[model samples]
Target chain A: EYLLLTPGPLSTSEAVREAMLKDWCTWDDEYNKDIVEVIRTKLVKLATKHSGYTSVLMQGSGTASVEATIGSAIGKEGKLLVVDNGAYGARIAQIADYLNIPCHAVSPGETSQPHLNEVETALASDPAITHVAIVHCETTTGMLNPIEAFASAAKAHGKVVILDAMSSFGGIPIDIAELGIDFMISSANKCIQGVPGFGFVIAKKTELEKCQGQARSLSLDLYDQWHCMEVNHGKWRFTSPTHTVRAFYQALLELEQEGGIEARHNRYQTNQKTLVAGMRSLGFEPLLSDDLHSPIITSFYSPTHSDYQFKAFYTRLKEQGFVIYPGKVSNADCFRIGNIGEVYPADIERLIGAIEKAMYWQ
Target chain B: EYLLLTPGPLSTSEAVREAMLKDWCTWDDEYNKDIVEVIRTKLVKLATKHSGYTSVLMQGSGTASVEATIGSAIGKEGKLLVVDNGAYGARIAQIADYLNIPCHAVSPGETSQPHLNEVETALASDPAITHVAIVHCETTTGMLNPIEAFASAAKAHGKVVILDAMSSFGGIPIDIAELGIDFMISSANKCIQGVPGFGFVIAKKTELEKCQGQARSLSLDLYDQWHCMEVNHGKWRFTSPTHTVRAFYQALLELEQEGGIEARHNRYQTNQKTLVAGMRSLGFEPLLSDDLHSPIITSFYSPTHSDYQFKAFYTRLKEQGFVIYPGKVSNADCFRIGNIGEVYPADIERLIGAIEKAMYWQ
Candidate 1:
């Protein structure tokens, strides 16, 4: 009944939700061989055309996949250096710390991304750090980092690069093979447009092979999880979210049928551009400049008008059928509006019209 | 389109699945306060009528919640004693090893559970063991352990008790408070009949309060996960499986309307009894004695006829709209048939008929 303009659990197609109508036995042949295997093949193709990369789906939210990568992918004697530009980036560092890995971060503020040479020098100075983690799209402020430079710097230092593409993978094009990204993480409910339940990790086959005993927790063991799926052919070590997994395959089919990521990205971009232009015309300013903006979500400054209360305004907007997100940028009063999922430019226009009405005295 | 006669992801009611058709905002007030908070309350009440018992939903399979409980519930100075009789029990010991905690297991073989005094003597032999873990219903062969003695001995020794009631909780009622169980684990897709995505832990408040810094993995940290839910009144530490969570609440409501666990238990008991009798008439002998059956699932020894093959038999039954489970018992040829979920004795009779035809060969 209402549209989610937040980072996600975004709007999904009726077909995707309908795919979940049937209950699936986790170990059933058709569920695994027919559905799971096909989804993996499609995801690998969608992520890249390269043959050396493979993808594994983990059961849980996106952060669990991110944690799995950080806790399991770092080889023994591996230390991590993170490019901390926003909330999601800091979370990578936190997961490393929780796993007892020696991690240091170079913060460039939420509004700015670190320079290529700056991160390279940081890695060069710390010879012990063997892996680099960075967020491609930081949902905290809806800011997109320069990932090509991060990967370039890491590759130069002989460090494996991990990309948190939670909100950007399907909505934006990234040549991970060319960019030397070893591991990339994203959720089922984000740009892929499935409902939330699980996330996936796309990794270089060679890199993942080194993570055999690297996992600190068994459930989040990336290498073991991938091995089980490979050995048994699409079987998860634990009982998976059957309906969610089924829905995700349907979501992948829809993505492929809707002309792949390129066409999907075009729709998200148009939605964001139309949203920004419409908001600007209604006297709203985005938190980040246009170049740093991620088409996934946009952060906007709070209205300066004393009568403009965001709480009441949000409630009014929600009643008018749009749900916006509160800001997470440190030391700033801001709100976020997302443009991903089964959203279109026309939906953005409706949200803009609703927002215009919501900002008045009521 | 077909019935899942496996342990779970079992058959769910249309209303339970109907709840998931809508997309939910993660941080939306209505979702958190209305759905999550209500679920927490109902779960607490459903597990026990006693106060001080609280529930927290963890995002992942049943094993993840089991990991969270084992990795988080123990106090700073703790060693775990696992009652190992089945695959699931051994998993507890494995989780303890992964977290670098000292763990020892006492195995009484798959067909037998340790006597109450046998477990107590083991605990007494190891003064360092501060926590005891057991599985109420071991899915390996649908063997139900006598948990009263396990919890009784733990409480006498002043040790914290963790119950992995993964497949048994809702279908078979146990008074956690009376049994002195500090933490009990179960999945959404079990007898509650929600689709798989998340599992939950019902814990004693004081015991959970002592587990502040015990979690090794940040994502699986139980204390922090519980604290955030309390502090914010229903917020998860990370992105939860929203669609699954919503469906679970509806499943809970349906369970309540269908007469809670007691009434649900009668239906499952009848289903299991009828299934066993019908299978026995068809020359199938159950692996366990009736007294040891789980009432959730029953395992039957494979037929001795050279014409009978389980793989072909399972495929045949599956094509006839019934999906049964393969055996997990070592040193035995067996197949399992579950009687829980939204299933009845009539459904069991249909499965029995399907099995009778499937075993007669091509």
Candidate 2:
């Protein structure tokens, strides 16, 4: 009954959840052709109006898809450069470490992004780096990076750039082709407002073709998955989450009906603005500056009172019919409130009104 | 809506799908403690009535969990033995190959299981074979293997046994601890009748302890996943399929309300018997001997009429409001009918009547 004010696994629409009420066969033509293929086609259109880019769905969490892209894209002799501005961006480096792939990261503070000069400096210093990856909206601090500028930096350096847009893909507008982004990753639960089950990777065809034999794990092999879907008419390489896929299709339809990403972005921007203004008046400060904030989620620093407790505060908000995220910014005491999903300006106003009593009352 | 007579993504109870109507937060106790932990405990209990066994859930399809178990359970110096009776059974060896682990498979015919003597011979011949993996029911041909016999032989040879119970865990009862099964893999969409999203691994604690850093991919690391869950209390290492996990908890409750596995198994067995009798009377013969049939699903050889066609027959069944599976048995021209899920004897009777009209009308 309560709303999720967290980064993901956000509050989905009733109609979107209702779409999962039916059963589907994984190998059936209707499921593959009518639902799965439609989702893929719609995602491709939503991602970019480009001819050479395609999307492939992967089962598991967003990080699972991230692993698929990293492991499947890096050739045997390839090295990766990760932009580590937050926990999510730092994860690409960790994944590379786990796979025994050569990798390095340029660590910026959680609430900031690396400058283009700094990015190019690292690229020039590291001749072995074949790929560069960064997060578009790092959910850890609700910091939005200039992916367009970074993609240009990487492209200028002659390196492929992968974007982790898991939290921002649908709530924020991204120009995949114009920005020269080679690969972009997103989860179903975020801006699409579907429940969590799978993630998708939108990759350039030429870059994806180079990934054919690069994967060390069969389940995370990207090119093989794309090839299978291409040949089999939207069939997954493995058993797909049929109900989740159906719900995602409905969510995509909802996104279109709600006037696509541009309109959803405007709604979320208004929600985020309302949340920040109201919370600030209630004595909560944002973790980052206004310019660094994303329309997806906002991180707020905890109050300075000695008696103030994150757990007690969270419970009070939860009991008031709203649930938010605990702090993830390691350097400061903060909490995150999401503005995506089926959330709106009215919901944020109600949430902030509840927050006032939660903070003031005994 | 059509009844899914295919292997799985089976027709679930309406009560199960209704559970997904609500949204869940991944970090919240209501989702993790009340639902995720409860599902893990329930699965472990259903797997075996024993101490020292715990279960961990993994994202992706059934093969994803299978990869986690195999890639994590096998130590750096360890080798694997896979019993290749069908496609699913053969997949373990392929996973091992991908992971660069030394693996060998005993290729029995699709309709048969490796004899205990054959298993023993292989073990005797290879001292480095550290693990033995097999599918309980090879969904490829619906041939039920004697996993208990192989587990015994493997234990006798001091080898750890892993069972791919993807299609048979809940519908078919197997005392994992009693049978010396160290690791057992299963999916949410199979016998439990939940929609697809994730799979789980039920593992022995002591054996699980030995897998601490054995994984080649961080996403599929089993011991780290178990350790993380143990420390955080039901928190998945990554984003879980929250909706699917919730539905699974409901399915677990329904499984209990339906009088547990014993009652469900009895119903499925009866359904299989009725299907075989009815189909045989309609001029369709089973691919395997009656003794080797799986109560979960059955493969029937296509009728030997020049006018008979598998695709056209499948279409007719689909048009008749029943959806069945095309065959997976490589050596036979066949089609499959599933007995599990919310399917009943009455459904089968009606399906048979529909089959009769489809066969003779044209």
Candidate 3:
């Protein structure tokens, strides 16, 4: 029963799990510094286009990093224009509202990506809009938004571009520097195939510094986190998720051995293609159009059957060794299958077979 | 090697770690809801006092939770009077500065406890101060501050009191309600014997609501954290450390089976006595005065021996299966041995033997 198909908190390699066997010294200068440096060096390498950006890892989930980046990047008088097209995009606005940070959102259509025209107008009309936030890939619909284009529009308007590349960065070759992204966030559990418990932000030094004393919360302070990493090298600002960090370090090593993002993207794409083709042949239709769908996950509309209950179907698949996730985007009655994590074409084939068996036999 | 220490991220029971063998869903209504409910129910029982106070298990380390509590509690216009006796106390002010929250500090002598008279005067003079923050037990010098007396003074002055009982909560039964504490922060990695990953805040409902929209960082927002727990039981406001949460739930079960906090505290005290006496016999002196000492960790002045290096000595002891910590409160040369974290008298005996062997044997 080896099946973990949901994006993130997904399946990890055995070497990654083995990394958690050691108990680490949190306050030891050399060890802490090592932890900090490994992440910064590897993150820069992951985003092949982002040579000018440095990364700071925070202990918590992916959303923690996103909230930290948004809360810290926006100054007291600054206003943020969020591109809301999915759950994660809406989350940015929620995080803003929770912190009492000034922000507004423009929703893109369900199948559409961030509208460059709308963003250009929003920025031109508002002088106080110092930052533009958008998700690079919305996991909800498995849609890859046009981050490079959005970043260009935001840069033209003199606004800092922050990308929540949680589900996109490692599986998609993001040249963060080339795209003019001032700040981008992603989790260890995402493209790296690491366990949950931590996330990191790739940010420019100048832009990060401006966030100095701007963060409202202590744990999720992007500027503070960046400064701590800069000063202490690899030491975390607080008690870090040592086990998770170690696991992620191992995951990074495997990533290097596997040839980084270019190879990872190919693997994901192939798996997703095989999965979609298999499901399509089995009479399952993709919820979104192919052009709008990301290679990471595919949402499928429910089959026309009286006994098709998601929970029951999901449980049957789980029992047969494949874990699936429920769909989240509104007005879409669907379930999702992800091709990230430690998944491969072989697992996808096995999963497709299991899905067929569950649908027909169970 | 087997080291007996008080339970915490200390010596986690095999059963507890085994619970993490299976990956749990973070968003599934059934599984995630179970994690949420179990933690909330268990934490309330662990509070020892004040049924009105609810606990919200937040992601990150204990310091993160403490910082969140301070950052979210004091409004932009409010000021905090921090009681600084050791490292953790200084940390409160540091977090305040990091969040740009206005705060002033009162430092006790190296071996002194929190002076209630000094706190009263500070409150009386600083009319603008809206909150008082203190640590129940400072692990830096193994000193226990007078939390009850200080909280009483702050309560009389109509200032909200916050307690960072990170090391003492599950071991020392503090009547949070009777002490008039608005917020008390602790972590899973301390006396609870759970693995490190998440921290928690026990706050009164009315006072917690004041934190609404006051959070500087969304991840550390006390109000948002509590609101999520209120609405969704024990589910975190964001992605939680599922493995850690699972271990903690198991730790809670073992805590009750082993006689809860009272029994845990007695064991820690016993180990502390055994460790101190053994170390004293070896010519090492305790840093703090006996009256102010905490029963968790004891700081010891380095012995004047030729070729003695803390790094080397620690390495030698670690080779013998004991992992100890260095002192943070005293800038001078000192080391600390913790009695918490699944430690027992037998483990302390082994630690004594290891220290003796490291110091005396070639």
* Candidate 3 lDDT by residue in tens digits, A1-362: 45678887777877777666555566555457676587788787777554567888888878888988887888888888998898888889988887677887989766678678888888888888989998988998898888878888889888999999999888988788888989889988878888778898888878888888777666777887778778877877677877778778888888889998889999998998899999998889998888887889989998768878988898889888888988886887898998898798888988888899889533
Per model, the share of native interface contacts recovered reads 0.87, 0.87, 0.42
lDDT of candidate 1 over A197-251, digit per residue (tens): 9999999999999889878888999999999889888999999998899999989
- Model 3, C-alpha of B149: deviation from truth (Å): 2.2
Candidate 2 ranges with C-alpha deviation above 4 Å: A360-362
* Better structure of 2 and 3 per lDDT: 2
Candidate 1 residue A332 Cα shift, in angstroms, is 0.3
Cα-based lDDT at residue B35, candidate 2: 91
Please give the lDDT score at residue B169 for candidate 1. Answer: 86
Clashing pairs in 1: none
lDDT of every model, 2 decimals: 0.89, 0.90, 0.81
True contacts kept of 1: 0.87
Tens-digit lDDT track for model 3 on B1-362?
Answer: 43433223465677666555555567666555677687877786677455667877788878878977887889989898998988888889988887777887988765788777888889988899999999888877888888888888899889988999999998887778878988989988788877778898888878888999887766787888888777865557667877768878888888898898989999988989899999998888988777777888888887778777888887788789877777665666788888886677888888898889888533
RMSD in Å for all candidates? 1.3, 1.2, 3.2
**What is the DockQ of the complex in model 3?**
0.45
Query: Residue A124 of candidate 3: its Cα lDDT?
Result: 82
> What's each prediction's TM-score?
0.98, 0.99, 0.91
DockQ of 1: 0.87
